[PDB]
Design a protein around this nucleic acid. Structure first.
Ligand SMILES: [Mg+2]
Lengths: 537, 708, 7, 9, 735
RNA sequence: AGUAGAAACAAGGGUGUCCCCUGCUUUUGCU
């Protein structure tokens, strides 16, 4: 009614008639931003200067008929003069205060339901529990965390479609929501937001902020989680740690852990299967985590885990180009190498057929408990800078790096035959055979590896073969960095191919992931996991 | 056939059809069988929808409600919007693809088709393409055949007959043109078009003129680059290059660095916006917080507390000014204060009369008239604005004394921080106690008094400048403090008269006349007060320990100026605190990360740890953590008060020399490529600023002390 | 806390 | 005395 | 006892007290008058560093251009611009060899980018030069003016909305024999081919303000709308290339830069007892943007885009060509004064070509005499250099290539080098068995840089054992130390509005705690100071206080009216409940449970007139200018309330002849606002449609009326009335 | 005079001493 009346009044005038009748809808995106107002170049100075004026604020014309011209003290609240470049009217902050003390009161019941993110933040803080303060040297590792607890891991486009359906139902267009999770979210939000007077744009913005996973590269000192990073300023410090437990659980962490557990179990059961590829594909399409089919989670969940990467690549999707060895992810930094096949003899008089890498190279190795950077030459180790939570993690990192170096010094350190097999009773490749053998025990290797003196430099320390810190002695090219060795930020997503044995090979042919690289650790699921396939029965 | 189709349809129908086919990006002059098919579809659909209304009860109507809603012949956006709205409101699920129209009587979507082929073939094709069971499908034939779902025809027999007749007559017309046989409809193939971006004309010439010297065309350069393989080019050119092009490392040893060369000239003079060490305040015990009462009433009360007013007389005249004007300005201020006193009503602000003395002192009508160049090109003395370097000044000994006095402790607290949320976490309790220590050490520092005075003065100046740009406004210099006995005091330093303040640019200047009380005789350090006209306005009987001693009380009167940017940055001087405190905090925390405990209490209550912070004739002097905090606070405050591009340049250049000296101290074997250039860059920033000169002198002292 | 300095 | 915040009765 | 804070460095290492050396509590230097002198000095310096080049007269613009590419090799250590094409090509080839497939994949990604980017992407600029108005205008306004002028001149390929189509329109307009423009009393002006060509290649020069650490002001340039798209595509390609290089510090943030620097430093430093020395250079290049040549960038792009479609190569190549044929405006001009007559006047820079030299002083006279040969149509011809310097990512690629040339397989010597590069800045590390090898490696790097046109500032650089260094004000001393002063200007009232300012202050404190090692007590005192400054700026002191302000009466009345005082916002005289634990909570939600029902309903009333919602991209988004670097976008968490108002704009334009645009602007808003009343989603996702505004509006009105009537929410009389009105509008559209 | 520093402010426009308009808008780039 009033819309057509406004359109008629607009069509009355000639210039605006031409503007309306000669500009296409696409041109709206440009002419609406058309403005003579230069972007402010010193907002602080401008605000300090303008708050000393009489009418610094702008308000809609309705304010004229909504609040009185003058206050009880004859203090003017709004002025008739229009704001430059619009029909808004200049008004004073006294007008805002008068509104707050005398304006039309309205029931605010959807606000907690619309701004759910902030209210969840405050509830989590209120229900949290604190602990003691530990004054000690703090080791901070820079890691890519996700500062957005409580989101439904919906991408930009799916989030946009859900927001369009919820807030602007008639403008959905040609898209029909398919994933039952999206339908559930849409129906829920439509029910909660029914009869909501808040401006549609703010509701859409809040839904987008709540449903999309954000990320930042931050120096985390302790645990990583959407609820622990959120309160990072209050937990970690330069020289102190504040023990704290947020008073709330977030479904995203639950689904992440449950997906990790399910992928690990499914790959473990697929290794034994006669057809690992077909069995893995069937298990992927025939399982549910917390009422959600795993196929939908996999295409959207960005969590990184060898089992998760194997499952994601099985159906066919881009994965990180860094290769998995010994439970560590290796991302190449500089240099290059060529694969040369060779034969080698161990200290137990056994022939091993290995594929050595010839050439200078640099890698960054990231593990669950420790991380390092490795400068490696052809069949020789140049440098290994490592840092871990505790001594055992550093030991595991050093072992995997030493095995990866392919040096003959650790080859002749082998004692006994290498007869390691997988769960399916199949012989492993020589590299993983050596890795397992040295993981069982490493006294001989660490003793029979080498010893060289070092320079005492701050932030660095040595390790002896018995794995005790030293200040004047260390191994060959191995140094423990007291300060956390920062991990990589971005990893290239590349096409890969998977054979019938779940060995993931890239275009160059090198193997990135394999079931033998999946950890044997078994945790407790946070969400109920159900398997509809015949094998898991 | 284009004429046959165009002339045999309603202009609106052809317009809709052509717009619809253009929406896909096709060329109407190229594909026309599609055009004919879509135009026939539009015509049949319009006949289907037209001549059909619904009355109030919901029955048919043949000549208000429209029985049929059209979907074809519309932009994809509008069609999708209308179908989505219909599906939402009616409840019928929307189809995957776009139907042709919608019917309200039966409340379902119906598809219309016109095909030369038999009805069954196209019916099956469309039905198995859309794959919908709740949408009607109606197929027409050029030969009169027609069929809908379950053989159920929605439209009346008369409407179907009319549609068939229209189709038959248009087919007869097309056959009369003879192209009916060679029509065979047309289907959408969704072609893909490769991109192209050609460089031709003027731009090709520009490209040909934007290549290395040896190439004449862009194509030749492209061919050369594509067929390029690295063949010792860099190595050959390195061999060819002269050996004089090298980066020779100069060893930086303990005997390498030399003291900075300070500029020579007349001694530097005071340039702050208010007195710092010589300020005298008249105080009254008033139980009010910062910025509570009326400034003018407080000023009058403070003035009342002083007896011993004397007839003003020039003591130290302004060399380049008109001192009688300053005397008259002070007399006028006194008279106006008396007038407001004998009024029984104190307004928030007072506007001074625009007398001749204030007109001169505040730079009234000093801007040259603005004229067009064509009107004054023949003027003999018309020339460019003076843009020479500022005259050089030598460092004077008063700036060091100012800094020394700014680092002292005061008998009154100067900062009353606001409240914050209550402590709930142990780390918050530790932070609260640490901040209590900090604010205790900082609340009684003269630098904090300078911070508060500057913030108040700049805030008042900015507010007055914005509020009254055309009036000479009087502003008292007022501060609030708490004595060591806990009694609140309001102090008056002096007065400021703000002139016209039509400030447009952030660098535009507003002039003001500042008259401040003091007890220091200017004649002891005349060079420091070259910009001032100092008067004597009384003899104060100071209360010393032995007894009472009478001393003259002087009024330092000067003309100063400030810009919007300077006032704004003076309003934010409080953040200076943060700087110092941050530096202090990191110093404690670092030492607390080795002892596994908080040493804040130890540092602040035992004074066992000291840092070298000053210089004495015996050597380097060390101070406590509180002294270090006060010194850093004073340095930050003086940086705020004496900001200038010279300070920025000196800081930036001397940072590198400090880092090089530190590397030498760390035994890292530093080396320089051009140390003389660095020294020249540092020295170019020392011209006349007393603060920068003092910083350079400090650097020289540190250099002497850090290399032995 | 009552700040104090030797000077 | 203090040449900034003295006492003058 | 004389207090000397510098002496503190005798005990605390300089890095550990580096914040003491940053005087960022005072105002930064500002330019007061014209920038013409700096621009002329820049042009003369650019033509002096490459004066041993080939002089050519452009056939199109008729301008004198200087070509130093493949010129005489340097013979001294002064800045040089004689880059060698083959050396640059070899550097690019070796960069490709070190990272095979980098160029191909980056080209594919950027090519996918090109076909999808929209013309509206150009609106996210800042004060673009407007050749139509011949002055700086906001990016969106400049784009709209350019589109209108193109349309009036029969250049309508940009209706498709693709940026590449707009580039095709620019290409075609370049060949037009006559351009028609409209100048405000609308008047028509005709520009010949050469005039329009010079206008399209012009850069508006001004002076930079609020720069720290410099004693002398310097000039910056801003291009027009004719070159923005080409530069955007070139920068997208450069960004794609840089992302894949471990030695490139762009476009990653501070944390990633610190991680990369730590990784490289630890990699190089660590060695056994005595096998090789490592020395880090904290280098800095001199006249970086005055010695880089657009021709070298063209060679780099040509090599990068090998074995690619021709159209892609042309699109990527247009930008270097335009930059090679650029012209620079000489600022506002000068101001003359007369003491005897007490007069002042403005002399436009357009007149400097033939003005008497008796007015100017010695230095300005010399500058004018030196630059006179290059002047054309009031603009100076500047072929060499990169004055504007908007190729910040290709220069990073060149620096990374020079760094990568330091591998042991490329030096073929005992010495080698590695490090990080960030456009102009760079940190180097050279490893060699002895000091002689270190000197040899440093000399090799310096000479290669000279060959590639990069000049290292020997005055601003030093070398020391690789334990401590600096990089873009990040100070590393066996680990990165805190530099709090760098962020000091961020601690204050941002100046957006009450709610946004509170949110931004709290967030800034939280982030400086997380990243810059801000102490707990320092954070608490920063909160106290921010609350004080906020209260004073917005005159929202506590209701019970006796502070005299224009807003005191209303706040006092609201305070006495309220029952639960702890629920009021600080903007309404409420108390401050923020502390370290809850620095991540918006204020409205922080004290939601303590607010009165009436006050809560009034404050959170979606029917208030003070809240205006623009496109979603600006929701809870603010522009913040840091102490160093360009302005950034910051997202803050806040609930939209009556305190989210918008401050008034500048009205000076009302007194000029450009006021016509103001009126025009208002008209647009009306239409745009009306569109929102028919397409409420239009503010969330940009609508698309070729039909006119009126057609879509009338169609939607018809459908909405029909649907609402069928739903029974409107009586037939109202539906008939609106149907009649819509018919009236539809018929009035034809006439 | 004063601010200030490589160029500026010390009000600028408008209309016929009053009145009207303006306080970033002939000048603030780029990842
Ligand atoms: Mg630099």
């Amino acid at each position: 009614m009033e819309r057509i009346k406004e359109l008629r009044d607009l069509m009355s005038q000639s210039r605006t008639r031409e503007i309306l009748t000669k500009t296409t809808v696409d041109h709206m995106a440009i002419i609406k931003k058309y403005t003579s107002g230069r972007q402010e170049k010193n907002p602080a100075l401008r605000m300090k200067w303008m708050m000393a004026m009489k009418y610094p604020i702008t308000a809609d014309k309705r304010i004229m008929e909504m609040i009185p011209e003058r206050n009880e003290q004859r203090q003017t609240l709004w002025s008739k003069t229009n704001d430059a470049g619009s029909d808004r009217v200049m008004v004073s902050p006294l007008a805002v205060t008068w509104w707050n003390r005398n304006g039309p009161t309205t029931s605010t019941v959807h606000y907690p339901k619309v701004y759910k993110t902030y209210f969840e933040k405050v509830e989590r803080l209120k229900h949290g529990t604190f602990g003691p303060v530990h004054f000690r040297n703090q080791v901070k590792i820079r890691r890519r965390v996700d500062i957005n607890p409580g989101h439904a891991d919906l991408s930009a486009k799916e989030a946009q479609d859900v927001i369009m359906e919820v807030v602007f139902p008639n403008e959905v267009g040609a898209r029909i929501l398919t994933s039952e999770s999206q339908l559930t979210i849409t129906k829920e939000k439509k029910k909660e937001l029914q009869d909501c007077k808040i401006a549609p744009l703010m509701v859409a913005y809040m839904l987008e902020r709540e449903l999309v996973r954000k990320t930042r590269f931050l120096p985390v000192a302790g645990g990583t989680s959407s609820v622990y990073i959120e309160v990072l300023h209050l937990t970690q410090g330069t020289c102190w740690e504040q023990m704290y437990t947020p008073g709330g659980e977030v479904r995203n962490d639950d689904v992440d852990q449950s997906l990790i557990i399910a992928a690990r179990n499914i790959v473990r059961r697929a290794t034994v299967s006669a057809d690992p590829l077909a069995s893995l594909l069937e298990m992927c399409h025939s399982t549910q985590i917390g009422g959600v089919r795993m196929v939908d989670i996999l295409r959207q969940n960005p969590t990184e885990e060898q089992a998760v990467d194997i499952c994601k690549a099985a159906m066919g999707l881009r994965i990180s180009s860094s290769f998995s060895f010994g439970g560590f992810t290796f991302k190449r930094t500089s240099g290059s190498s060529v694969k040369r096949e060779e034969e080698v003899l161990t200290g137990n008089l056994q022939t091993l057929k290995i594929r050595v890498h010839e050439g200078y190279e640099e890698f960054t190795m990231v593990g669950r408990r420790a991380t390092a950077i490795l400068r490696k030459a052809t069949r020789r180790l140049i440098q290994l800078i490592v840092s871990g939570k505790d001594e055992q993690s550093i030991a595991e990192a050093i072992i995997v790096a030493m095995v990866f170096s392919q040096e003959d010094c650790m080859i002749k350190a082998v004692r006994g035959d290498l007869n390691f097999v997988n769960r399916a009773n199949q012989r492993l490749n020589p590299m993983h055979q050596l890795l397992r053998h040295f993981q069982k025990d490493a006294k001989v290797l660490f003793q029979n590896w080498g010893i060289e003196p070092i320079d005492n430099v701050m932030g660095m320390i040595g390790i002896l073969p018995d794995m005790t810190p030293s200040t004047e002695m260390s191994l060959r090219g191995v140094r423990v960095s007291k300060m956390g060795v920062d991990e990589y930020s971005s990893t290239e997503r590349v096409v890969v191919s998977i054979d019938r044995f779940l060995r993931v090979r890239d275009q160059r042919g090198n193997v990135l992931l394999s079931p033998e690289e999946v950890s044997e650790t078994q945790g407790t699921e946070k969400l109920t996991i159900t398997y509809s396939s015949s094998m898991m029965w | 056939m284009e004429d046959f189709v165009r002339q045999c349809f309603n202009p609106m129908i052809v317009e809709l059809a052509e717009k619809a086919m253009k929406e896909y990006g096709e060329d109407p002059k190229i594909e026309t069988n599609k055009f004919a098919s879509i135009c026939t579809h539009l015509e049949v659909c319009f006949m289907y929808s037209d001549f059909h209304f619904i009355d109030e009860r919901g029955e048919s109507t043949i000549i208000l409600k429209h029985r049929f809603e059209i979907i074809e012949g519309r932009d994809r956006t509008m069609a999708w919007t209308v179908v989505n709205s219909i599906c939402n409101t009616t409840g019928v699920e929307k189809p995957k693809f776009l139907p042709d129209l919608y019917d309200y009587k039966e409340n379902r979507f119906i598809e219309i088709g016109v095909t030369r082929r038999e009805v069954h073939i196209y019916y099956l094709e469309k039905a198995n393409k859309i794959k919908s069971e709740k949408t009607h499908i109606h197929i027409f034939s050029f030969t009169g055949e027609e069929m809908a779902t379950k053989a159920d025809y929605t439209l009346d027999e008369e409407s179907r007959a009319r549609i068939k007749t229209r189709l038959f007559t248009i087919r007869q017309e097309m056959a009369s043109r003879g192209l009916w046989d060679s029509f065979r409809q047309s289907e959408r193939g969704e072609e893909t078009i490769e991109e192209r971006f050609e460089i031709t004309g003027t731009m090709r010439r520009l490209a040909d003129q934007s290549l290395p010297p040896n190439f004449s065309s862009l194509e030749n350069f492209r061919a050369y680059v594509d067929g390029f393989e690295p063949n010792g080019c860099i190595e050959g050119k390195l061999s060819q290059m002269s050996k004089e092009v090298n980066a020779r490392i100069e060893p930086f040893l303990r005997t390498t660095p030399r003291p900075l060369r300070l500029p020579d000239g007349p001694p530097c003079s005071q340039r702050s916006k208010f007195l710092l060490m010589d300020a005298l305040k008249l105080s009254i015990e008033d139980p009010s917080h910062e910025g509570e009462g009326i400034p003018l009433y407080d000023a009058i009360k403070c003035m009342k507390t002083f007896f011993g007013w004397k007839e003003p007389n020039i003591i130290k005249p302004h060399e380049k000014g008109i001192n009688p004007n300053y005397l008259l300005t002070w007399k006028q201020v006194l008279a106006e204060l008396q007038d407001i006193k004998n009024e029984e009503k104190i307004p928030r602000t007072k506007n001074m009369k625009k007398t001749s003395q204030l007109k001169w002192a505040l730079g009234e009508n000093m801007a040259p008239e603005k004229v067009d160049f064509e009107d004054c090109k023949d003027v003999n003395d018309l020339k460019q604005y003076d843009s020479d370097e500022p005259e050089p000044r030598s460092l004077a000994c008063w700036i060091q004394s100012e800094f020394n006095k700014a680092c002292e402790l005061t008998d009154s607290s100067w900062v009353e921080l606001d409240e914050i949320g209550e402590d709930v976490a142990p780390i918050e309790h530790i932070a609260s106690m640490r901040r209590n220590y900090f604010t205790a050490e900082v609340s009684h520092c003269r630098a904090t008094e300078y911070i508060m005075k500057g913030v108040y003065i700049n805030t008042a100046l900015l507010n007055a400048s914005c509020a009254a740009m055309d009036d000479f406004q009087l502003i008292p210099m007022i501060s609030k403090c708490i004595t060591k006995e806990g009694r609140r005091k309001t102090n008056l330093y002096g007065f400021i008269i703000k002139g016209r303040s039509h400030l447009r640019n952030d660098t535009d200047v507003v002039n003001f006349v500042s008259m401040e009380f003091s007890l220091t005789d200017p004649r002891l350090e005349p060079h420091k007060w070259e910009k001032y006209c100092v008067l004597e306005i009384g003899d104060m009987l100071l209360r010393t320990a032995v007894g009472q001693v009478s001393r003259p009380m002087f009024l330092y009167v000067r003309t100063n100026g400030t810009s919007k940017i300077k006032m704004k940055w003076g309003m934010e001087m409080r953040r200076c605190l943060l700087q110092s405190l941050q530096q202090i905090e990191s110093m404690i925390e670092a030492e607390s990360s080795v002892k596994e405990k908080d040493l804040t209490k130890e540092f602040f209550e035992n004074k066992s740890e000291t840092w070298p912070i000053g210089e004495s004739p015996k050597g380097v002097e060390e101070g406590s953590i509180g002294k270090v905090c006060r010194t850093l606070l004073a340095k930050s405050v003086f940086n705020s008060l004496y900001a200038s591009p010279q300070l920025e340049g000196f800081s930036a250049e001397s940072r590198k020399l400090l880092l090089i000296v530190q590397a030498l101290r760390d035994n890292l074997e530093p080396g320089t490529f051009d140390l003389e250039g660095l020294y020249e860059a540092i020295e170019e920033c020392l011209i006349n600023d007393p603060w920068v000169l003092l910083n350079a002198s400090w650097f020289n002292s540190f250099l002497t002390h850090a290399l032995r | 806390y009552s700040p104090t300095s030797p000077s | 005395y203090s040449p900034t915040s003295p006492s003058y009765s | 006892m004389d207090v000397n804070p510098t002496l503190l460095f005798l005990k605390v290492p300089v890095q550990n007290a580096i914040s003491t050396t940053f005087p960022y509590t005072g105002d930064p230097p500002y330019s007061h008058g014209t920038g013409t002198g700096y621009t002329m000095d820049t042009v003369n310096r650019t033509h002096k560093y490459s004066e041993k080049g080939k002089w050519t007269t452009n056939t199109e613009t008729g301008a004198p251009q200087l070509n130093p590419i493949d010129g005489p090799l340097p013979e001294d250590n002064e800045p040089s611009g004689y880059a060698q094409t083959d050396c640059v090509l070899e550097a690019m080839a070796f960069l490709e060899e070190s990272h095979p497939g980098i160029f191909e994949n980056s080209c594919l990604e950027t090519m996918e980018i090109v076909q999808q980017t929209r013309v509206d992407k150009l609106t996210q600029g800042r004060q673009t030069y407007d050749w139509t108005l011949n002055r700086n205008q906001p990016a969106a306004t400049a784009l709209a003016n350019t589109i209108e002028v193109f349309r009036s001149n029969g250049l309508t390929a940009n209706e498709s909305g693709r940026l590449i189509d707009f580039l095709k329109d620019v290409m075609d307009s370049m060949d037009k024999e006559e351009m028609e423009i409209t100048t405000h009393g609308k008047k028509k002006q005709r520009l010949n081919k050469r005039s329009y060509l010079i206008r399209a290649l012009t850069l508006n020069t001004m002076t930079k303000d609020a720069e720290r650490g410099k004693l002398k002001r310097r000039a910056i340039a801003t291009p027009g709308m004719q070159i923005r798209g080409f530069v955007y595509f070139v920068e997208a390609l450069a960004r794609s290339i840089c992302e894949k290089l471990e030695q490139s510090g762009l476009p990653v943030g501070g944390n990633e830069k610190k991680a990369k620097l730590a990784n490289v430093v630890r990699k190089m430093m660590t060695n056994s007892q005595d096998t090789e020395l490592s020395f880090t250079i904290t280098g800095d290049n001199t006249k970086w943007n005055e010695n880089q040549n657009p021709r070298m960038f063209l060679a780099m792009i040509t090599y990068i885009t090998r074995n690619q479609p021709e159209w892609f190569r042309n699109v990527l190549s247009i930008a270097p060509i335009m930059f090679s044929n650029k012209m620079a405006r000489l600022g506002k001009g000068y101001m003359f004064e007369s003491k005897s007559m007490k007069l002042r006047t403005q002399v436009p820079a357009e007149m400097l070509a033939n003005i008497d030299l008796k007015y100017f002083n010695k230095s300005t006279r010399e500058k004018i005499e030196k630059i006179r040969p290059l002047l054309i149509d009031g603009t100076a011809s500047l072929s060499p250099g990169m004055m504007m310097g908007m190729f910040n990512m290709l220069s990073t690629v060149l620096g990374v290539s020079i760094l990568n040339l330091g591998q042991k397989k490329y030096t073929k010597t005992t010495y080698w080098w590695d490090g990080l590069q960030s456009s102009d800045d760079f940190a180097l590390i050279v490893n060699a068995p002895n000091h002689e090898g270190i000197q040899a490696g440093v000399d090799r790097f310096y000479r290669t840089c000279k060959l590639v046109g990069i000049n290292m500032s020997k005055k601003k650089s030093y070398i020391n054992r690789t334990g401590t260094f600096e990089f873009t004000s990040f100070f590393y001393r066996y680990g990165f130390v805190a530099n709090f002063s760098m962020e000091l200007p961020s601690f204050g009232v941002s100046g957006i509005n009450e709610s946004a300012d509170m949110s931004v202050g709290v967030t800034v404190i939280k982030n400086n705690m997380i990243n810059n090692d801000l102490g707990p007590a320092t954070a608490q005192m920063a909160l106290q100071l921010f609350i004080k400054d906020y209260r004073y700026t917005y005159r929202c002191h506590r209701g019970d206080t006796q502070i005299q302000t224009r807003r005191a009466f209303e706040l006092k009345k609201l305070w006495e009216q309220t029952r639960s005082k702890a629920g009021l916002l600080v903007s309404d005289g409420g108390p401050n409940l923020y502390n370290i634990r809850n620095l991540h909570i918006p204020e409205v939600c922080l004290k939601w449970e303590l607010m009165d029902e009436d006050y809560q309903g009034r404050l959170c009333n979606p029917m208030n007139p003070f809240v205006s919602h623009k496109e979603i991209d600006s929701v809870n988004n603010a522009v913040v200018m840091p102490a160093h670097g360009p302005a950034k976008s910051m997202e803050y968490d806040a609930v939209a309330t009556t305190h989210s108002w918008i401050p008034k704009r500048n009205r000076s334009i009302l007194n000029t002849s450009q006021r016509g645009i103001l009126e025009d602007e208002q008209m647009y808003q009306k239409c745009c606002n009306l569109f929102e009343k028919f397409f409420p989603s239009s503010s969330y996702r940009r609508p698309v449609g070729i039909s006119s505004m009126v057609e879509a509006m009338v169609s939607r009105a018809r459908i909405d009326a029909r649907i609402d009537f069928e739903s029974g929410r409107i009586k037939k009389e109202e539906f008939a009335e609106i149907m009649k009105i819509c018919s009236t509008i539809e018929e009035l559209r034809r006439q």
